[PDB]
Design a protein around this ligand. Structure first.
Ligand code: UD1
Ligand code: UD1
Lengths: 475, 469
């Protein structure tokens, strides 16, 4: 401990040992492990530059077959990977397990992870169909908190959903200590430093420290599709988006949906002082949020759907060179703490340092924006049911089923009531007993509405209707 | 009831099984009746009619393999499956070879399992479990009794899974089922290859899947040196991506009774009793035996492979036959111990599944560290007996002490050679025994022995180091 004491004294963090004599050896060793693992010199520096750092006026608006084929070709060449921002405990949904494990009550009861996995396997199959060889889209999954072990167990239980273990790469995001307004690391307990994830922009520090870009390079990957786990409609490894970005020579790309409600909680892609960035929804004034352009659309209408494209060379530069130049954002927090007694604070007593995944768009030499349709591509799981009526399991399950219902109609199929009366595209729900059409199509059958003609063309179905690898089921 | 059974028996040419029915007490009749009704005589005849009717294996990372095996164990992804002449009627697991500790083979195995759980916890930081599947035969109740009395040697009841393999009737050379007693069919276990059928029948692979098991280490009960759930073997098999693996030692004596791993363009073991002397003696240009990969009855199976075995491969396994001297009751009602073999037992062999492996690997180990089987009673042929078994274990642990920096001394305090000369017929080899709870394979001995010296017998256990006096 005299080497540790010295390290702590040099950094001005020697209060971290103040309960040492009150701990049993079991507990002392876990503190020791925690402290020995930290870079106190670096942390003081991060704090100092974060505090030094501690918008609307400078914001300005953002003014196909070949794409899909290009994307499928890149997939077929083993040149595409995906990187999943898997998040931490699903505390915003009222659960401790990560969001990828959430079951929104689809007819199949499939989790978000399973749907995403089946989308990946599907594209591998489609590419093999068009270009003739077996191909691989590796799946890099960044977990946070300490959800990694349970995520691995979940995947193993499900046999990686038909993917191969060797092509799913789990890695866990680092944590930073909470700091007081004086820059002192806060003990949560006598034997425990208070620690927290450093935001999804902690991705970059984590890729660097764990040599993840080097694995992509070894595999020969060129394009990375970064996406958020919470969106049930997400077009994982979307070949149209990948082809778009490849043909534009993008180093970085972002998908957006049209924001139509001023107070929708989406970051807006815009230019600030000439450069591309996402301005977070909690940063803009209501005046900026509500500004309309002459067509009547919102001026800032490019809503960030957390779906990005990076080339591997750009990611390498971000990880090795750029992100280290960015200072952390300060967020004040109520941090539970221990002289002698365990206290829960009624007001913020400390700072969490964080970065966001979109903070490095500013470094892109060729940034591009790809607009998509909300109903086909963006239905996020953000909230518990009944919290605010939006972005919850009910809206998520209904968005997917609505989408699949539309696929069936567009492929020439029809839904009928119990008398064989064909239902409208938009049915009237008038009695307490009426429910929307329940339709669920596995990604193994259809990625984006293609390939349904043998299943549904010129046929009538009574919902609920499930289409999957075992056929067509009317429940 | 009886006139119907008789017709069933008559159709199968087995009606002699009722020979003594007119002399049996009522309760005796009920028991024989229940035995016979459960048998499928058509199938048995079919088994009997079929049953009665090579290329060499082309020949450091040890720590990396061990670490991977420990990681599998730490994730609860490893289980072991125990396959369970000495002149005793009780199962071999209960045999006491006369170690200083007097521990039975079962106890030594149990403590190896407990040890690895602890070692994997030390390595990776979480508590973990290695389920122990124990395949018995119709040994089952005695084995369970024994374990319960010893409180599972410190393991949890719920992680020791006893299951009973099938039995087959002994049959004459003419395919007639043999009566052991006037009201009892002579039954024997169907070979250690009976594992696969039993797995399918009792949904054991479902159980492995439910538990989250990925790798099974299958091993023979009789080897006092057996590295139960050996993390090196498991790790090797994991890194090679094998579905199936077999541990071997180098066979150097042509007539050693070990099966030999070979290719027959697929992997097999050819049992020692099926090889010609010519094949057994053949030597390659380096002077080693051409067929030198001796099967030590230690196998690796992935659970997906066992799933494929249960789903697809298990039905194609063949019965081996062996001529046996089967105790019987003659046509005069006399109990006879036959002067000449009088029938056959049909048996499957556990290694016959290797022909279905797509990624089969062989892992060579050192005999002195890993293989000292208990096959024979002490006087019978000078080999593979309680004496050799006990001395092999004590020699190993002696080597562990020296390798860890300790020394043995004589009664005057003088250092003994690694290989001392025996002085007279009353002299003894160094006696040393180290509990598996202290050391699984020679690790963790520094604090006990490094730069210390010991007068044998030396025991090291959870109560420390003991010079016996
Ligand atoms: C910083 C960020 O990403 N902002 C994006 C976000 O905002 P939004 O503020 O809604 O993001 P969340 O609140 O969904 O995510 C922030 C981070 O919080 C963590 N977390 C969140 C919920 C939870 O139950 N557990 C948990 O650990 C995750 O690490 C996650 O990556 O998604 C939207 C699209 O839907 C926006 O348009 C984006 O600008
Ligand atoms: C078929 C077999 O494995 N042969 C092996 C065997 O022969 P070996 O002829 O000496 O012995 P066995 O076939 O009896 O097999 C030994 C193991 O199988 C178990 N058992 C046996 C019969 C049964 O119906 N059920 C059952 O579980 C025994 O309890 C024991 O644990 O061990 C040697 C190594 O020492 C050989 O190199 C092997 O080729």
């Amino acid at each position: 401990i005299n080497d540790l004491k010295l390290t702590l004294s040099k950094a001005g963090q020697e209060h971290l040992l103040r309960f040492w004599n009150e701990l049993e050896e079991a507990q002392q060793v876990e503190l020791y492990a925690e402290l020995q693992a930290m870079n106190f010199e670096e942390l003081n520096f991060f704090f100092q530059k974060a505090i030094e750092g501690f918008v609307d006026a400078r914001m300005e608006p953002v003014p196909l077959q070949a794409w899909e084929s290009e994307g499928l070709f890149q997939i077929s060449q083993n040149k595409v990977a995906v990187l999943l921002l898997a998040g931490g405990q699903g505390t915003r949904l009222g659960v401790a397990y990560p969001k990828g494990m959430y079951d929104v009550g689809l007819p199949s009861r499939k989790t978000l992870f399973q749907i995403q996995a089946e989308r990946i396997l599907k594209l591998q199959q489609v590419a093999e169909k068009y270009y003739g060889n077996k191909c691989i889209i590796p799946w890099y999954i960044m977990t946070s908190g300490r959800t990694m072990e349970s995520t691995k167990e979940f995947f193993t239980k499900h046999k990686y959903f038909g993917l191969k273990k060797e092509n799913v790469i789990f890695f866990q995001q680092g944590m930073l200590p909470a700091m007081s307004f004086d820059g002192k690391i806060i003990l949560e307990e006598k034997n425990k430093v208070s620690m927290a994830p450093d935001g999804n922009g902690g991705l970059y520090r984590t890729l660097a420290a764990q040599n993840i870009v080097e694995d992509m390079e070894q595999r020969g990957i060129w394009s990375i599709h970064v996406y958020c786990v919470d969106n049930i409609l997400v077009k994982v490894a979307d070949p149209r988006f990948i082809g778009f970005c490849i043909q534009k020579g993008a180093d970085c790309g972002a998908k957006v949906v049209e924001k139509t409600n001023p107070t929708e909680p989406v970051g807006v892609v815009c230019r600030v002082d000439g450069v591309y960035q996402v301005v977070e929804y909690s940063e803009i004034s209501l005046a900026t949020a509500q500004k309309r352009s002459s067509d009547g659309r919102l001026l800032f209408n490019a809503g960030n759907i957390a779906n990005h494209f990076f080339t591997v060379p750009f990611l390498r530069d971000v990880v090795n060179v750029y992100e280290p130049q960015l200072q952390h954002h300060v967020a004040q927090k109520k941090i539970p703490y221990v002289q002698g007694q365990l206290i829960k604070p009624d007001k913020p007593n400390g700072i969490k340092m964080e970065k966001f995944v979109f903070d490095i768009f500013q470094f892109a030499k060729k940034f591009v924006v790809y607009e998509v349709l909300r109903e086909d591509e963006f239905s996020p799981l953000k909230n518990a049911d009944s919290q605010n009526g939006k972005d919850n399991p009910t809206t998520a399950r209904h968005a997917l089923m609505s989408l699949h219902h539309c696929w069936v109609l567009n492929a020439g199929g029809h839904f009928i009531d119990e008398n064989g009366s064909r239902l409208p595209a938009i049915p009237r729900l008038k009695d307490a007993n009426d429910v929307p059409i329940q339709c669920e199509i596995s990604p193994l059958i259809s990625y984006a509405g293609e390939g349904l003609e043998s299943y549904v063309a010129d046929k009538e179905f009574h919902a609920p209707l499930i289409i999957d690898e075992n056929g067509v089921h009317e429940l």
